[PDB]
Amino acid sequence: SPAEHGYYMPAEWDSHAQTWIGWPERQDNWRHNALPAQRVFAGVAKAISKFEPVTVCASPAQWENARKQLPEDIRVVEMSMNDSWFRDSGPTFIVRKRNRNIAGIDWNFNAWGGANDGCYNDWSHDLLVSRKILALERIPRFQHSMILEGGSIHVDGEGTCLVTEECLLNKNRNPHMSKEQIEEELKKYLGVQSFIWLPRGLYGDEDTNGHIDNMCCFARPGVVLLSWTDDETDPQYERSVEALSVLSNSIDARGRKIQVIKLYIPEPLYMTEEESSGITQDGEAIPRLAGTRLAASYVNFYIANGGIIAPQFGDPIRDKEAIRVLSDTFPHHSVVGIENAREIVLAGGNIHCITQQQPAEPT
Amino acid sequence: RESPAEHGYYMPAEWDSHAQTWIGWPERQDNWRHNALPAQRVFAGVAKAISKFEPVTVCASPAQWENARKQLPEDIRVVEMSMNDSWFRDSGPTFIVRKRNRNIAGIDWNFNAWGGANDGCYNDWSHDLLVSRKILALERIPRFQHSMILEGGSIHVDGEGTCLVTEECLLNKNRNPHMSKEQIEEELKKYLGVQSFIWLPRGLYGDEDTNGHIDNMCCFARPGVVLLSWTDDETDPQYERSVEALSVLSNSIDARGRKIQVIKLYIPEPLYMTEEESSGITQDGEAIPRLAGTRLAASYVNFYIANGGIIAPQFGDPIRDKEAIRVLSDTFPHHSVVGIENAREIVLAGGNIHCITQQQPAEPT
Ligand SMILES: [Mg+2]
Ligand SMILES: [Mg+2]
């Protein structure tokens, strides 16, 4: 019903009031009692806080630890969560030009595929994250019954929505809805007019089922960054070539062809034994096994007000080249490389997955 | 360890303009009968009444957040916060303001559940220790920490230099036994911006467990004027306390040089916990006993002042309930007096409306 009052999802490069981030904890997903991941989340929050306000949300047991680790100008609030992926469990904010001029969408959530296919067995706290954030900020809430995660949608703020079929059409999401029915809900809720459907996401992203935000994103209207490799023996290659083909046959909501900038993935990363042994083994979440291909891409960066927060994976040549490409692509932003982003990818995500932008409310 | 006095701050009176009111949410079964359901309804009643005057935020534990959110109308903000019990007057911050870094700050006093390991009301106050910091963090308001144990219900101010307190509470060996009266005054001058003190020896009869907070005994109606808990029945143990307090007040001069005027606010006829009430409480030995026959510490002085409103208890004594509304209405002719029914449900757990609230002053421009 956001179409009724002229709401739309702005592009991520439009002005933010603040960024929301969770705080990692669970010992069956985050190694060494999540301490290495905590230092990286703190580093991401601090980096962003140079550009715009940040609120970090931490569990009751973690609140003091978070407050101690984070700069004073970063707000720390108590919140229960099952895990710390606010891109996906937090609200998708929408605005209008004028009662209020901002709202948040609270989508249904099922831990990326639910009882049979999801990443963990209990998502009851995550179900409340969006409501709690919006209640805290006194921003109106639109609830939707469809299962959706913010990491599965990208917009250019000019009417186009970029998505994957792997995720949005998956049997573990909304199998009762056709492609056209899904598009219809996204038009009404995000204020978009047209879609670009990539068939697949990044190789190795079986746990999210191929979220767009680890595969391809907008840099500006008519221009995307695409995860790329020239190595034809990498299972990523066929996905990248297929996506490029689809993009070359796509037109955006304003009638533009799409320019594609290749953003080369790191050389293949595989979880080590020291890494896998630091994680508790039982049956509340998916097993983390030694030798699994890490789903790493530089495309999982976050845009803040005048800043680009980008991962660094410990691949010397590809890390520096990603910074060069991103600096060239966003010449009016400052690019900041986040070391030890590998610590987030071990848990199945990256910088974009841990953030949720709150747009500035228009006046 | 810089003092509020250094930065220009003082505690404004409760009748000055608020940005919002903060309230906790009751839960624990060894203090609140029938799984806290009766008490939740009265807390919700208080929040709704205040919400007609000014914004309200209710804080509820992780396990209660959904129940609170469903119970309360959406114009009341509901936030998740861990707590050992729901007495935000005492565990929440004491806000202070200045004329001209923000023009509002909060004091985060030390806390020990009203007397500590040997004389306190429950055995674990770990979450309560963090309530003030969490509230101030939520609002991005600067924090002044104090190592002295103090509850907001133990102090009252007129916003004009006077502080009203009880000896029973602040000089108790269960609070700050290594501080003298003079040392306590000096800290309160620095932190609240006060210059003079009115010390009543004792608080209300029946308030043994919290050691006689001023806010259940006597408060300011306006600068120079106090409301005093009163009875004319000389067989009630309350009588000697009321008479003693009146004597002190009658010889008191406030910070601006006014002789204090006293308005008597008559307590209800003596109220006692019933067997039905007591039997609804779990006896787990983490909290103090709640026994049938106990005198309830009930006084109409334990009201809250909101922007244009007075939120006052009704205890079920129909004569004294009506008289208290009459007195309050006469005393606050520019406020709307609202009576909260079933306030007895709060008093069964040792407090009342003033004890469950914490005002956040408007920040001066
Ligand atoms: Mg949701
Ligand atoms: Mg405190």
From Swiss-Prot, chain B:
pH dependence (record): Optimum pH is 7.0.
Source domain of life: Eukaryota
Reactions this protein catalyses: agmatine + H2O = N-carbamoylputrescine + NH4(+)
Positions contributing to agmatine binding: 209, 215
GO biological process: polyamine biosynthetic process; putrescine biosynthetic process from arginine
Catalytic residue list: 355
UniProt-listed Gene3D superfamilies: L-arginine/glycine Amidinotransferase, Chain A
InterPro entries in the record: Agmatine_deiminase, Peptidyl-Arg-deiminase_porph
Class of the enzyme per the UniProt entry, highest EC level: hydrolase
Single annotated GO MF: protein-arginine deiminase activity
Pfam families found in the cross-reference section: PAD_porph
Activity control summary: Inhibited by N-ethylmaleimide and iodoacetamide.
TM annotation in the entry: none
EC annotation from Swiss-Prot or TrEMBL: 3.5.3.12
Pathway membership: Amine and polyamine biosynthesis; putrescine biosynthesis via agmatine pathway; N-carbamoylputrescine from agmatine: step 1/1
Coiled-coil residue spans: none
Keywords, comma-separated and alphabetical: Hydrolase, Polyamine biosynthesis
UniProt subunit comment: Forms homodimers.
PANTHER family per record: AGMATINE DEIMINASE, AGMATINE DEIMINASE-RELATED
Described purpose of this protein according to its UniProt entry: Mediates the hydrolysis of agmatine into N-carbamoylputrescine in the arginine decarboxylase (ADC) pathway of putrescine biosynthesis, a basic polyamine.
Family: Belongs to the agmatine deiminase family.
The protein's name: Agmatine deiminase
Organism phylogeny: Eukaryota, Viridiplantae, Streptophyta, Embryophyta, Tracheophyta
